[model samples]
Target chain A: NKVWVIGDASVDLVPEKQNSYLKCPGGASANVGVCVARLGGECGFIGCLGDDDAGRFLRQVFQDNGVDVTFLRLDADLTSAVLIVNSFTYLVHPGADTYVSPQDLPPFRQYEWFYFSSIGLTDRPAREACLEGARRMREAGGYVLFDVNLRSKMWGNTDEIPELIARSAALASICKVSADELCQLSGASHWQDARYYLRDLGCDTTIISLGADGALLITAEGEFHFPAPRVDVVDTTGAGDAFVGGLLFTLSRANCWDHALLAEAISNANACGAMAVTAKGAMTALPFPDQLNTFLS
Target chain B: NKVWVIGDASVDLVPEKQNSYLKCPGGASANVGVCVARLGGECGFIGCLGDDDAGRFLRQVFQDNGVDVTFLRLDADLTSAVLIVNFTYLVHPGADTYVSPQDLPPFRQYEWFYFSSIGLTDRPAREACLEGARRMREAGGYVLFDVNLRSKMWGNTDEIPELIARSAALASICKVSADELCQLSGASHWQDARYYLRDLGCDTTIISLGADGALLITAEGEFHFPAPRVDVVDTTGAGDAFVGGLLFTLSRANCWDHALLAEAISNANACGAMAVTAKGAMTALPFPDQLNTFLSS
Candidate 1:
């Protein structure tokens, strides 16, 4: 298996009315694993989710998507669940997922590439566990992917979010951040400065997601810009994560992180993200590898 | 047969972290109806709610709690249900109640009294409807009871809540004001001054409450200062609409508005509050007659 995902399993509750809700399955790394698997890549998740229905859903989703789940940790308390109003649909973090402890972590990582999101940043225990796992992955010469999906409500303050994100960046070989998060961390509205600064954080590669504006890749050589592919946008729910999925999968297959290879990966990732926004949610709208290849051709 | 319950019907959505909630029917008048019915007094609700589940729930609750719903209006969009959160084990309003407009209202008259709570603050329909209902009740020689449960969240500006409260105060024969409300209405901390000014906007006055030492109306011709005769344990939420419920019931039963009658009503409300403190919500709260008889015997 080339991929592993770890996250808390919890039902994402979006209230239809007061006291009424529509439930869905979600977790950042879990979604990444599923997106990768749905694109015909071998992926797996290693994280703690409560032994509950939400946990069952995350566990089964990993298996259903053909992602390996041997490294997954099942916990008594599911990792996290998000509740949101549509006013501004930003995902909250550290909910049920915060319950995951260092003790609940699996034995070891046995994958070439591991992806981690900010759910681990909410508390010290989970953060310590995730950081430890990423360190081990880096020691084994595996690629560590970090996404700073900061949720302000869960962390109580923004000061700690960046500190946790910096720790994550230190572990990440390939790190991605959005302009919003960039502005939040560095107080820099200029995207290039943030991209350059984040790239200098000892991470080998940095990707900046610019919402509908497309994405930028920064490396040792120079910056490569990939304009957003044309698509009728509906919901950009999983656009960035889907793009990460494509990038990680392509990089694993190509077995290179050079300039030309990264360019091709960015183009492929752009197409993948573009395809995601054409439909409703994240995984449901993702293009398969064959479809991606056809598009590439 | 006689009651004036006001405020919107709302939908409420509680996030998963908050768990469950008791939809203790809201809207100042609706609660008074509930209080009246529970007290073995005839009561009716007259307000609009969204035709949605929240409206349906309130309509059913009003009937179930023995408040007549003959005048409850289910308009194009029922009164919005508010999603209240029990974050601190106390009720805090959330998203469920988004107000919609209603044009026509069902006709009714109050026998014992008319009352309104937080619902009359919403314009342009609910406010007008409450004023008209209060006028009719006054015309019919029915006692008008107003509860100034001033919530800052109701409007855009601080002045709007006070201004709306003043309008409702104009129609009420007997009114209740909280220490907090008195402050909001631009008054010194003195209960005598607060009651004097607040009652000047109305006919009769009684301040039945607990905390900051519950003070009865003093220094008024129709006023009486009788501290609630109850054991002091917890008197938090029992003070608000319960006073309206108690006094409306008492006024209907031909209780004098003198010192003895004020003390009796305060005792009844205190008992209702005791029920609230013992449990979580209004489920254990006593009605007018039930609390009165309990305190009497």
Candidate 2:
């Protein structure tokens, strides 16, 4: 398989109006898995979800996108996490997503890449399982991609997050940090310094997203900037995950770690990010390979 | 001196605007328990809530209101009911309020029981509540009835008045809002309204005037207390607060002297007024300290 994404899968109850909400399958890790699959990459998901209709909806979405869910566990008691859009409150009673144990971790699957984010690091069992899973993947010669998707309210202690993000970064060969996260984690005023700092922490390649300005890619060879293609930005919810998905899809296909290969991957990554923002939800605007090529052309 | 309340408990998702909501723990029976607890009475709630965060939230609210949740059952699979205000849509999958008879507490433990209108008529919940009420009354427990008359919930309008009248006859004290009393009892005036409800086996009767005042009829005499003038922010939970204040004041009194009766009725009126000066139904409910200060003034 190309990639295996490990983390939370949730139901995003987005308010359409004062009284009604549009339910969408969401969660950062789930988005990454779907994003990769939609862009024609062979991907699988590893996580815990509730054995409820909401959880079923999430599974159906992943399956429809051609993502394997054989490693995903459905917990009997806890319902899947629900993200209420208006309040940004996660109505979760330690839902199945946070209940992932080390025992639930599959044997090293030998996938090309393993993707994760800071969200799974919020609690135990899941945190321990993710760490263990990443270790096994790395030992099996698989690359790990870490996204510093920081949501302060999701954790009990905000102060523990910086250290946790750093630790997660250490396990990853490729790291993605939003501009806001870069400033907070590295205490750096510039993008180059932030990239150097993250690279020093063991990431051979670091990506700093700059929203509409596109993204900055830093590697041992050199640094490159890919300017974002202008699009009518409807909702920027899952753009970053889409970028990661596209980047990984291109890198996995490339034979060498050269300037041209990295440039093409970063260019496609920027295109995916732009395409995602043209719609409301993270999953809604993601383009298939055919659509992505058309948009890029 | 334990008070038991039976009925529905729901999460009232009130709309802040087109895209957001202010969540509050609500439902007639839940509010009645909260009302009694906030008014400084030993009150307990009986119902089902999901073993979800919403359910946990409701339980925490009951605990915060100083209401005993020992009898509250968290349904492992079902989610707590959510009432979306502004739309009046019920996104519920059989919440904990549809409690079975086996889940009920021992009737002998309660001195007073508060019964709410809507939840009692809904199949199994109705059967369970009625059975519990019968047992409580057989054990010489006093019953307090609040006829909220949520017509939209009842399947048949014709069955409502009879069901309500039968339930009212079981209570020693009955509190009915003016609109409900006019429709259910067909009484145009306050004195006639009191006489009609008292004629139904209720020894003590109250008619809520809604912004004007409340009329109380007892063995000692009849009295009318004007509502305390306050800036009304929301009138959502005012009636429930009145029932709580009235029950608390009356239960604590040794004898119903005319002056003491007037004081009790007046306190309840103040409680109703105080409730309207806040935003949500339960969140705006006045605590004993706030109630005392408002009453003293």
Candidate 3:
């Protein structure tokens, strides 16, 4: 089973010792694709890249790793986005990745699952591409996992965000969000209301990440809590991406999930999240399958 | 003769074809130091660098090229400046400008010291360079001031030119581009303007002409030198190399004889064109053997 991950593969510059910056290949979609690939799961990256150094560096990196690049295109005119690490400042820099075309989507039926990030929904063209791709994936009997994390900036400060997120959550097979994003999405303070909001929109799995307390998941069957293994947290930059990647890697094996299988998937996800923080950069600390298995035990 | 080149030793990211950036050791003062070193002239770079990767790399490079960093301070809290191709954007823009007057070398060490217009942007750097130039000129030492304006970077374009003109007055030998001469003087005839600069405190005013040659505006008369054409590979730091060549050639001679000065400009002209025949900023700077071969040819 293959997972199709869509969005930007951008650079994250980390301010480190010697009054200098350390650059790493980042972006939620890219981090997740890499995490899944490292976990011995088949994954393909479908994204746009600027025909520049960092853009081609990301392209070369993904190709060198186990991720597929059949749908990746480096646009000659577009420059890639750049962000500062820890500041989590996506900084309103729009680029090639935000202009993904619906017409250029990969073969949807080839993958068992399609992953989506809110970053891809920033611009209209990429939003349309994500929505249409997810729609086609569902029509082809493939699952859609949508990670919804909306920062205060609105990325574009547009009025379209709430409605766009609602539409995205409605189409998602598995909707995962942080505590603050859940509050923002439901326009309510309580977690129960946010869970019901997504449940009403027909999402089968609603997962909410709870930092040190691990994570909780809700489905039609019942709600279950999965606690993370304790590990030293270094940098949680791509922890959530790793968690989602781990969850999909386990769940995609079976067409449907039972309580035991769901519990196992969530446990693996929490473990991946914990393991991610042991290192400093995004995608720099992703665990291999052997490491994941060892951590789970 | 020893030369002191003071300013930033920044990393320049050149956008290349095939989705890549060619990183080169650049900044006007840095190029001058390397060029002087390559020409077998004893040169010391007086600047500040962050103790980071690019900072350390640049420091190592200067050391390797036979340039002294005796007055160079590797500040622990400051970060080195970064410039994209054609000076499009200034990245992590600090450290280069934090160079303090206290970090300067003893005035008795050299007879000539050069600085560029870029150092004039940062208040601390500008003060140090201007104060240092005044002291050098006061001590009867030669001060070479290169006016290479980057209007895109400064906050107050209205005031910088005035400051630059005043600073040029302190220089024993002031160098400017043809465009810079027009910008600096706003004259109907630039030759009249060039001579007017010499009247303002400058002993000699040199105006660079890229492919055609250069104008040595000395003895209150202008001497236009023609350059031998060469295959242009990259023209990033050609002018800086010419400045170094001219400084190296002239500082060694006691005579202000017109024929001798003309020969130095021709040799400087040769160094300038030779720079364009290679890729990157300082890579093709000719050595003694190479220059001798070119002159004999």
Candidate 4:
């Protein structure tokens, strides 16, 4: 399956001391796209950006990172929005990603493995179109993966998210999230409980990342545990997302879901996640597949 | 005596509300340079700026205003300081206007008149150079005028100021101020009483700005008359300084000590003050010659 990622994209303006800032091209799905690319996977990002400078910058970021961004669309009126980073984990609300509607989604075809996150699924013709695109992926002898990276701030009509998420999960053969994120979306207190609850709605396989404690993998066979490798933590911003990238890369390469292949993939994924915290930024700290081999060897 | 203004020159950064900013050249001396140009006098500025972007903007201001800024120094290692315009009168300090001891006396050769105010005299080298330049002006049939637009937090150095100022006053035929000058020099309570003190200090004439009421003038020839002019309610900032412009203009026209000349110069100064109130800085202002006899006619 050729690698494809589909969701909203954003520019995050992180303010520092003295009215200065650091600008980065970001969005949950874009992070995954770059992550997949860094792990030696061919990737394409599909989303919308407004016809503005920020949109131009985002497009440049994708191209510069060697991600195929042909499916990217530029809306004449609705430009991409900015997420402000004031303090740690503090997000300022209602960025350009909110302006993305169903009309912003591009034609989704020509990719086998479709990776998406639950951001644009909060809204419109974009949300509905995304679901339709996922259904198409399912029909074309391919697989769809979803990450429930839900942001409460993006929802005004909050009730629509669960239904969209349920439909998305039904089409997904794989899904991943932090234990906290699982609880946040499913309203369950425990990782196993949330995984089973999501599985009840036809999620083929569920992964609950427990941070340094490792990851919990739940499939129709049973629950399996993958211990996380240790590393010095500098910035843990995109560690979990990198893990998802590793898993997708390994699964796509081996063309199988056997226990030995899945374990090896988990080891590679854990190593990648470990590498993320030893440096800064989601994309800047991304190491190549050979770097992982060096660490494992 | 050639007209000399001794004060400040600075690059100004103005922040706009929720948008961009209005950045330009600023400082009291820069203001006086533009003021003199508007008053139709042969003008130039004497001040220090960093050879940085803001400093570059300040020098451009002098050139753009038709001021003879031959003596202005832009040091390679030094950058021009800035004063933020949050209010018309109050300013927040930015970078220090770094003038080494050597940079001072060299700037004295170009002009007979040196225009200066609080911000310029705050730094000792620029201050000594200005006053030293004034002494040179005195030796060369020129004039030196001081604006007691004082900021007490600055200019505390005892030796250089009164040293140059004592010589500057001996050479200065006219001195100017408003209410702040009285408090600064600890002059008498009554406006007339303050005039006698300034006159005794070898100020052959003194101008007391009474804001909206008109300007009071007391000179050596038993001249005591207030220029009859319309009152504009906006700014007292450059009120007397504009009057200083007019006085310099009259002196240049060889009509020194003429009450008629004082009246005409005051009329032109009124135009300069009027211009600043409607817009910020030098934006909608007329040049010195523009306050012509036609306006009076």
TM-scores across all candidates?
A: 0.54, 0.58, 0.62, 0.51
Which DockQ-derived CAPRI band holds candidate 3?
incorrect
CA lDDT scores, all candidates in order: 0.59, 0.77, 0.79, 0.60
- Cα error, residue B160 of model 4, in Å, equals 54
Candidate 1 on A208-269: residue-level lDDT in tens?
A: 88777788888867777788866788767678778888877777675446777778777777
Q: Arrange candidates, best TM-score first.
A: 3, 2, 1, 4
**Model 1 per-residue lDDT at A92:** 26
Fnat per model, in the order given?
0.00, 0.00, 0.00, 0.00
Please identify which of the two predictions, 2 or 4, would achieve the higher TM-score against the true structure: 2
The most accurate candidate by DockQ is 3
**lDDT ranking, high to low:** 3, 2, 4, 1
Per-residue lDDT tens digits of candidate 4, residues A1-297?
567777767655443333323466667777778878877788888777766656777888888778888878777566465443432221223334544344544444433677777776766556765677677777776777787777765677778777777788888877776788777777876766666656776786777778887788786677888888767887676787777778777777744466677777777778777777665455556777678777766
> Which pairs of residues clash in candidate 2, taking residues 3 or more apart in a chain or in different chains?
B48-B96, B49-B96
Better of 1 and 4 by lDDT: 4
After superposing candidate 3 on the true structure, give the runs of residues whose Cα lies further than 4 Å from its correct spot: A1-9, A12-24, A27-244, A247-263, A270-297, B15-21, B90-92, B187-189, B253-260
What is the DockQ score, from 0 to 1, of model 1? 0.04
lDDT of model 1 at position B285: 62
Which candidate has the top score in TM-score?
3
Q: What is the C-alpha local distance difference test score of candidate 3? A: 0.79
Say which prediction, candidate 1 or candidate 3, comes out ahead on TM-score: 3
